[PDB]
Amino acid sequence: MALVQFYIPQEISRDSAYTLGQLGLVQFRDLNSKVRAFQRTFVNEIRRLDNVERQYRYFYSLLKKHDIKLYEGDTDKYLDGSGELYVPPSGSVIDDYVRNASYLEERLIQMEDATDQIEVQKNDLEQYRFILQSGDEFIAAAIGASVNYVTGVIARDKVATLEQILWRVLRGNLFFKTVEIEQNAFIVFSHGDLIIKRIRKIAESLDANLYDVDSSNEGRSQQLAKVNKNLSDLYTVLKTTSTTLESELYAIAKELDSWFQDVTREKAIFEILNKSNYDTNRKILIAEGWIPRDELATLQARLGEMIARLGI
Amino acid sequence: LSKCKSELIDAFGFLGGNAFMKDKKGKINKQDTSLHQYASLVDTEYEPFVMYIINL
């Protein structure tokens, strides 16, 4: 049958024993935190407890990102339908369960950072596509650096008004101001090539994206052809990421839950054993008993008010 | 002074441009508010033609 483990103080030893008794538990022997090697204090268990809290953390990290809600379910027994299936009758193999969860956390962090890097780059280039298009076409000089244009997006035509007054007072009428309503507002100021920095200060201070060229893909002539090919690479690269995100969501949502319930039982196993010194001077008794295999289920369901179990 | 400032604003302001033209006419010398006092420096309002008011 399965070896079973109990812990208490010696105050309710008798009241616990009686109740243990009634569930067909056999060969109940009271022991101490020393005699069985597993149930002996080690620094090793203080680390092991930490490895389980790192798994717990990981579950939260993963659950947030996938957009799959918080899981509570809280089993450690085989009586329950999901408790039996998602928590194995055999004891813990700590090295393994950590090793499954560690890798996935790592692969997940790399993916997520990359997804974020792709998403901002794509949304900006698709936006400045149109802008550069307008400003170049408005030509035969703005495929070079002969005339200066300042393309830019602004989200208030009101603040643009304020900039026209400023520009005019201190920088004269060297601006030609054109505007189109976009999906933002496309503003354009057009200027000399030796006052370039002076207009920029003003633009910066009221917050606009007035740059002389708003994309860095430039390197084919005209600029817009490179920008369009880069944006074809961007668009599919986010998609591919999503496909990867999905594959990982299908494999591990159920698994996540099954680890979560496992871990509950492992936090319990280290406390039982006495995981550290605090635990020792709080629960001086650790007891031994044998529970038949079918019965093993109703036993871990039982949790007294101080008693927690591990079965093998 | 109040009458002077207004007549020049009305008359010449059009040359500077319609965008440039704001109404916040009037003058508060007490510290109850800091609106109503022209200067090109502030974004709050602007002079609409080259005009400086000199107070000795």
Side-chain angles (χ1 to χ4, degrees):
Chain A
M1 71 186 63
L3 168 56
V4 276
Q5 294 137 241
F6 312 98
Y7 70 154
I8 43 175
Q10 303 183 254
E11 205 51 83
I12 48 167
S13 46
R14 305 124 172 115
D15 317 67
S16 181
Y18 171 57
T19 312
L20 293 182
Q22 283 169 101
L23 300 177
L25 190 75
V26 290
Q27 293 184 270
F28 188 59
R29 161 165 277 279
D30 308 307
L31 295 183
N32 193 222
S33 194
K34 199 180 192 73
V35 302
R36 286 182 289 173
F38 314 108
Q39 277 63 256
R40 185 157 68 120
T41 44
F42 306 114
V43 283
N44 308 338
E45 303 166 288
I46 302 163
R47 305 188 285 158
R48 285 189 294 196
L49 177 64
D50 305 331
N51 289 113
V52 173
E53 294 158 1
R54 280 179 289 200
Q55 280 175 121
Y56 226 31
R57 188 71 268 279
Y58 301 159
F59 300 147
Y60 303 143
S61 289
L62 269 44
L63 286 165
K64 177 176 178 171
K65 291 166 213 151
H66 284 299
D67 313 304
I68 300 290
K69 69 286 178 191
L70 204 65
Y71 193 65
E72 291 301 309
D74 299 322
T75 64
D76 46 89
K77 60 281 175 175
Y78 307 124
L79 196 46
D80 196 70
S82 312
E84 203 161 42
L85 186 54
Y86 301 150
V87 184
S90 215
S92 294
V93 183
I94 290 186
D95 300 332
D96 196 24
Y97 304 157
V98 177
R99 204 175 190 244
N100 299 328
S102 274
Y103 291 174
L104 301 169
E105 168 67 276
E106 297 294 290
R107 191 173 190 186
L108 271 282
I109 297 173
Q110 285 189 304
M111 191 197 56
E112 197 64 299
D113 289 309
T115 310
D116 297 312
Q117 187 214 58
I118 304 168
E119 198 267 356
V120 62
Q121 295 166 4
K122 176 180 174 287
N123 189 62
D124 262 59
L125 193 61
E126 161 182 77
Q127 288 163 69
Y128 299 136
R129 181 189 60 67
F130 195 87
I131 297 306
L132 293 159
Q133 181 171 215
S134 295
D136 292 343
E137 274 169 36
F138 295 155
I139 200 48
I143 53 178
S146 205
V147 155
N148 191 246
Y149 33 104
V150 206
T151 55
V153 301
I154 191 169
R156 298 83 47 238
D157 298 303
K158 300 295 207 280
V159 176
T161 297
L162 294 178
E163 297 179 67
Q164 181 182 60
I165 311 184
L166 302 161
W167 290 95
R168 179 199 270 134
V169 169
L170 287 142
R171 321 288 187 193
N173 301 104
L174 270 158
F175 65 89
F176 187 75
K177 193 168 177 189
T178 297
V179 286
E180 290 165 81
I181 289 179
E182 298 305 333
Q183 198 177 242
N184 53 291
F186 169 42
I187 46 169
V188 57
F189 291 97
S190 308
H191 282 278
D193 301 77
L194 292 181
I195 55 183
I196 316 181
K197 45 105 174 178
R198 295 180 164 93
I199 61 171
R200 181 65 288 237
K201 279 188 288 85
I202 299 295
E204 180 52 72
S205 58
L206 284 175
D207 301 64
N209 304 85
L210 274 169
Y211 308 115
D212 301 304
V213 294
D214 288 346
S215 293
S216 286
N217 285 275
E218 285 180 71
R220 300 183 173 144
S221 280
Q222 316 178 59
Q223 295 75 63
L224 203 81
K226 204 177 197 296
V227 173
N228 298 309
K229 297 298 149 295
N230 194 264
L231 191 58
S232 288
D233 297 343
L234 268 157
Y235 284 172
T236 319
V237 164
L238 197 54
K239 180 184 109 301
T240 305
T241 322
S242 298
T243 315
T244 309
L245 203 142
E246 290 162 54
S247 289
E248 283 161 7
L249 195 145
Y250 309 152
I252 81 186
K254 63 194 169 51
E255 296 192 284
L256 270 165
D257 305 318
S258 308
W259 304 319
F260 208 99
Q261 302 176 309
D262 290 357
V263 149
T264 304
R265 177 187 68 166
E266 297 172 300
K267 302 186 174 282
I269 294 175
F270 302 129
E271 291 176 57
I272 296 161
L273 272 50
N274 296 157
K275 66 199 182 47
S276 60
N277 304 262
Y278 300 83
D279 279 56
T280 332
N281 63 263
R282 183 196 68 208
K283 289 290 179 54
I284 60 192
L285 202 73
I286 303 165
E288 187 181 38
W290 289 86
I291 194 73
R293 298 200 187 295
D294 305 275
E295 302 179 358
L296 180 53
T298 50
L299 198 60
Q300 309 190 61
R302 184 178 185 239
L303 280 169
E305 59 177 278
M306 294 303 180
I307 306 61
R309 281 91 181 162
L310 168 57
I312 301 144
Chain B
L1 184 75
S2 170
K3 305 168 48 168
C4 200
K5 190 183 67 58
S6 176
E7 285 178 61
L8 314 145
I9 294 170
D10 284 300
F12 304 116
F14 82 106
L15 302 157
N18 304 314
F20 199 26
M21 296 169 71
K22 294 184 167 194
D23 287 66
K24 206 74 71 57
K25 305 188 152 179
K27 188 162 174 177
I28 314 289
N29 291 267
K30 316 201 168 191
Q31 295 198 96
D32 289 84
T33 173
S34 205
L35 297 171
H36 316 298
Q37 280 169 288
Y38 291 97
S40 73
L41 182 86
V42 287
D43 311 298
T44 316
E45 64 197 290
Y46 299 98
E47 58 183 65
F49 73 95
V50 194
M51 196 170 55
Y52 299 134
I53 293 68
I54 299 171
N55 300 124
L56 303 182

